[PDB]
Amino acid sequence: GCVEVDSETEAVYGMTFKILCISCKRRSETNAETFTEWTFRQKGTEEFVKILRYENEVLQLEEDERFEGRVVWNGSRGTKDLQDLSIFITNVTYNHSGDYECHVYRLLFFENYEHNTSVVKKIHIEVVDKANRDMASIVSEIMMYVLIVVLTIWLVAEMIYCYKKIAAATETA
Amino acid sequence: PLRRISIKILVHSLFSMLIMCTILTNCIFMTMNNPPDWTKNVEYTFTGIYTFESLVKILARGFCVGEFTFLRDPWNWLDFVVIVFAYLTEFVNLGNVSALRTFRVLRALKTISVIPGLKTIVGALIQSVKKLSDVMILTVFCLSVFALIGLQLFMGNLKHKCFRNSLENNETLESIMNTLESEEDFRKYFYYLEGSKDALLCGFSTDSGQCPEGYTCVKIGRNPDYGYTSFDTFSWAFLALFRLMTQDYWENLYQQTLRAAGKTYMIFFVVVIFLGSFYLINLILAVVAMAYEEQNQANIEEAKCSPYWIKFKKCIYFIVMDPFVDLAITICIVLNTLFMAMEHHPMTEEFKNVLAIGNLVFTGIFAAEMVLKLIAMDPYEYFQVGWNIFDSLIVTLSLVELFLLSVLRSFRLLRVFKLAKSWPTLNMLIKIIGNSVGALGNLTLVLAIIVFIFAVVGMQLFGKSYKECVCKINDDCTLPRWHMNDFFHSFLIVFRVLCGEWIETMWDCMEVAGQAMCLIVYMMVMVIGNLVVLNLFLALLLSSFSGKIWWNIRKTCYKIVEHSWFESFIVLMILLSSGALAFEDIYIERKKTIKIILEYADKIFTYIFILEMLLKWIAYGYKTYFTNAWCWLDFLIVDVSLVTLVANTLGYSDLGPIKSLRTLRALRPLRALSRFEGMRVVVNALIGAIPSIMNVLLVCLIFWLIFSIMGVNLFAGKFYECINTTDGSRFPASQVPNRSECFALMNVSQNVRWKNLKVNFDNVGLGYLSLLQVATFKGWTIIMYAAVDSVNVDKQPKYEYSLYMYIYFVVFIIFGSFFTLNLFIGVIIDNFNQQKKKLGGQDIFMTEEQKKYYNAMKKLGSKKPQKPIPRPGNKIQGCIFDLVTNQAFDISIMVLICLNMVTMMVEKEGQSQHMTEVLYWINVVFIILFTGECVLKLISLRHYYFTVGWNIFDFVVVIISIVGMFLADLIETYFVSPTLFRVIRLARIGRILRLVKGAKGIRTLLFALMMSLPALFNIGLLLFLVMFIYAIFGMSNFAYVKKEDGINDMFNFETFGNSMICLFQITTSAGWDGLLAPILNSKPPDCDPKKVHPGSSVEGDCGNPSVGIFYFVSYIIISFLVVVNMYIAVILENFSVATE
Amino acid sequence: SMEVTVPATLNVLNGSDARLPCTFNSCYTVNHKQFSLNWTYQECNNCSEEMFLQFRMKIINLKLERFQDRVEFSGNPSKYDVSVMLRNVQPEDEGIYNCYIMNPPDRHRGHGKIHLQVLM
Ligand SMILES: CNC(=O)c1cccc(Nc2nccc(N3CC(Oc4ccc(F)cc4C)C3)n2)c1
Ligand SMILES: *[C@@H]1O[C@H](CO)[C@@H](O[C@@H]2O[C@H](CO)[C@@H](O)[C@H](O)[C@H]2NC(C)=O)[C@H](O)[C@H]1NC(C)=O
Ligand SMILES: *[C@@H]1O[C@H](CO)[C@@H](O[C@@H]2O[C@H](CO)[C@@H](O)[C@H](O)[C@H]2NC(C)=O)[C@H](O)[C@H]1NC(C)=O
Ligand SMILES: *[C@@H]1O[C@H](CO)[C@@H](O)[C@H](O)[C@H]1NC(C)=O
Ligand SMILES: *[C@@H]1O[C@H](CO)[C@@H](O)[C@H](O)[C@H]1NC(C)=O
């Protein structure tokens, strides 16, 4: 089923980038009618501008020139119960750096009950020039190497110790 | 002179069989359920014969002495009360005419006294109940203790219902609840998950969940299952715990309680199952077995052209070739059965005529052998042989079909029983089936009489109400599948209650015809019927049973490998590498940090294990390495690990077999079998028993092959129906009568679909699966329903059109499940006893440490009375000493303990505040008087109070009760935690657990449990390792499968918690059909092969039927063998502690 | 027939209050829309029936002139009770009182009949 996974927080210049916003229902059997809207403010500004509004099946992009012709939908297709609102940036620029907001305007459907929910997922990405490897990844790699080498050194130490002891044992006879 | 003729006609087999035949006709008449008008005179002549026999024995016995020697007989009381009731019904009668009509069923109990031997059989049953007494007291005590536990924990949790949020008309919850009563308006305000009778349970905890958006959880309304499933009152808690102890639909209580309260109560259900259900059932079995076996031992020990014709005959006898043609006929029988087994529903006409010519050729061969052997064996000397007369019956029943139905064609299979004289295990099966109607024919007859009595009693009592209005238990206002309106359906219900399926029918029967009467009837059925079935089972079982620096390098490697430091390091790395698999679930694209850490610890672990393997090589030598099963296992696992490592690090390898071998990481826990001696010894026991397992499983495969070929002939392709996919309801069969019409319906509207059952008898493989479901009793009803609805191959099923294939399933259960699992258990206990006699007479599930603890613990069975205590010198202290020591004092203390038990019992959900506070204060005064007797016992025995375990337990429970009340105080003062409040209040049941101190019969069986705890811990280690491996396999494969039935957001294989919960459910075979049902589907529109699954890259929500069937069948079988292991452990330890 | 419990004869003093007690029993749980109760009076055995009280989603008292305002409902039907009260009974109240109960889903219709006699 759905798993709410957070978006990546570093786009690299001139390349592509997919901004995850996955907002799934508490019960997957319910049938909703969801559409989404995205708001975005550049780094160094205090506002929020609507950029694109996904609907039943069509994605309508606003007149913002920063995203003109370089964003395509990447969420659920043909569902009308979207449950996954992630847009794709093609040819990332240095202007795609700021705080995004993923508005999820869900409308669930029950027996005689039509609920109006609204989930706002906020994603902050920062455009860069070269992809920096994760600090967790690099420390885990160096610690794997340290673990391998230290266990090998402990092994060889115990090996040579028992070797000298059994050598003394066979010299005794 | 009238007494003379009276007694002379009394003592007569003619008179005896007259009475037997009239009561048999009366039993056939009792099943009418709506007798015609003319049967009044028939019942009149029945009661006339009864009165005539009664007055005959009166004339022969009493003769004006007051029928003294007559009524000194206990069996004539029955016929006396029967004629009393008959003449009362004939004369002025009560208004409860049907309630006295059901009293004439005792005429079927007259059979027990009329038929020989049945009096002795029921005498033996009554003698065995007198031994079951104490385990019945113990199971009452355990179900009451666990019912108080479940009450404290889940009081009112089952009332949770996801209620609306936006109530218009400015209404409130109470303003709704007072005004809404029909289920449709209940559904318009609560959740009601689209096809359920009850509303969806919700939860306040974070894991239980999960009210949908726009719905908040609140406990308002009735409990689920008409109100009968709850822990609200102590009586409902006791009923739900008896349901857990008999494991009747206990999986639904499991799922409901977990959904309402929280998944963390998996611990409560684990404890309840693995102690109450298993241990108490096996204690019932052990005491029944001991009683019956001592009965049997005491019983047996207290007992003890003519010359051309002759030339033709000699030539034929010479050509029969004694060493060869019998083997030719045996291989012909095997070929004929394996030729009948290749039949399926979709068959080409070529395959059809192939099978036709094949079976006609085979029956021709068998008829030829028949006629040759009759002419060679003289016909008199020929029929001298029972096997040959059976062959004659079979060949006649076969030739009756060549040029002249299905079941008659399904009788060639009995030929495969001819393999018996060559197959010793099949001979044992034949011997069991023959003893069932031989030495135990009277016990089987008593069982049949009991089932008939209960069937007709249930019918007479409840079949009126069922028709009065089913509209309580059914919305179409038609009879349910399991009712009691007919004798056949009432007998089906009684049979289903002989199996463990009483609760689902008890709910409906309660709703229609009163809780008190339905509880009495069903509990009598359960207790008496299961007692007699267990007696028959145990009877059959027991009756059948009885410089050369290279050498220095090798030595250093040897010391390194066998050092305890290195061994503990390897076990630690095994545990780490195993637990590192639990984190790889569908939520692994979150927590990317721990994802990376595990991805590198993977390489670390495989490096460590490669170094371990190379050290073991250099230390042992390839010879002793590759001649070690454990070393071979470790070597195979590290080989798979190394292949995956090199492939992924080399790249160009994420294709097919590589990603299919990555799944074999779930076998990494298997490296702990070699390390943990507790698991190693149980694996050795299973391995030693596996050959006899294979023999008996071969016999069972051949028997179930007979039954599955029969089932394929009966229901091959008849389970197809075209349900309406919106609600999933078969079409009325008046419109849409067959497949060609449903396809026109599917062209007209889109929501219809001609669908199969996915576990059916379409071929012998699916037949084996369906027989496994019917024999485990988990999933059998959905098969039986479509079977008895079957009409033809491409015909829409009609409701109970067959209705007598229920007989096919009854016969299969009785023979296959009952007899073959009897053979299973018997041969497995026999094998374990042979193994135990081989092992010097030692227990085969305990290591050396465990054997030492076992002996030091079995010493606690001391019979020596200790020195009581030295009395003090002080006068007042000596007075207090006798006051504490007096038996009146201790029995008064036990009486106060029972009164405390009752104080906790009268608690319930929804009580008034006055009731709550008076209960508070009664508990407080109980605690204060318990503490008072404790402290006065102390100031009497200051130094020697603590030298006794039960006195230590008394002090511990006093302390924990005091801290429980003080912690309630501190909670009301400082904290808010209802869950912790309940779990702390749980401590007062310690005072109740002190009842065991006086009841020696309960103390001995509890000591048996403590004796069996070590072996049970070893088997639990092995079972938990198997469950872990299967849980990782589940998380890898069966995550992302559809959530169809039995797999839901609460229970699934999505994460390690969910997967281990479903696996603990399945360990008791419960609901494995439901769990396997969404895995078995593929091939849209059963699923979607390319689904997006947001948050992950894996697509498709279909399961692989092959790996699903293998997974679930193998887990069923391995869990069966390990619970058989536990059952052997508890039986043997109870035998030991009972003898001493 | 439906299980309806009433006194076959009810003897009441002129001027006293007469509770006409009847018991109706059927399986299931009563439904307000579903449960309907009707009471009729007759001056004599062969005499035309006059409906004087009904239950149809609530009590309807027809206020027949022959009873003035002396009729009251006196029963909780959910309890299977449908009794009525005739206050300050008069000699002309003598006659036959019929209770008819039709309860869905029960198809059958219950009928209780009371002969009310007025003392002197
Ligand atoms: C009422 N008869 C049954 O239910 C039955 C008879 C024969 C075979 C099975 N099939 C099977 N396959 C795997 C494991 C397993 N387990 C569960 C325990 O067995 C039971 C059942 C019911 C009970 F009250 C107490 C125990 C110990 C051990 N059972 C089931
Ligand atoms: C399958 O069942 C559904 C209901 O479970 C049927 O849908 C109903 O159709 C009728 C007429 O088309 C409508 O008046 C109802 O309002 C519908 N009810 C619902 C709940 O949708 C459907 O017609 C059935 N399929 C067929 C082929 O009859
Ligand atoms: C399956 O059932 C249909 C429904 O009756 C049968 O239809 C036949 O052909 C038309 C279809 O409406 C009917 O007017 C005929 O009366 C039907 N024949 C008979 C003998 O009743 C059809 O024969 C059935 N069997 C199939 C299709 O094999
Ligand atoms: C990006 O931003 C800069 C300054 O904010 C602006 O000059 C430039 O036109 C923007 N890019 C596009 C494509 O409009
Ligand atoms: C996102 O859009 C790109 C097109 O720019 C496409 O290649 C990719 O498959 C899409 N991903 C999803 C998940 O829809």
Ligand SMILES: *[C@@H]1O[C@H](CO)[C@@H](O)[C@H](O)[C@H]1NC(C)=O
């Ligand atoms: C991005 O666009 C620029 C011009 O706008 C172009 O030079 C460059 O090649 C593009 N890069 C990619 C990856 O499309």
Ligand SMILES: *[C@@H]1O[C@H](CO)[C@@H](O)[C@H](O)[C@H]1NC(C)=O
């Ligand atoms: C509520 O639903 C309406 C349409 O029914 C929609 O226009 C509006 O945006 C929704 N608001 C929220 C907060 O969901």
Ligand SMILES: *[C@@H]1O[C@H](CO)[C@@H](O)[C@H](O)[C@H]1NC(C)=O
């Ligand atoms: C509740 O609503 C009703 C009508 O919707 C209104 O008459 C009443 O005043 C309300 N009560 C309160 C306490 O607001």
Ligand SMILES: *[C@@H]1O[C@H](CO)[C@@H](O)[C@H](O)[C@H]1NC(C)=O
């Ligand atoms: C429905 O009938 C038409 C003929 O009118 C046929 O072409 C089509 O394949 C049919 N479809 C189904 C689903 O039966």
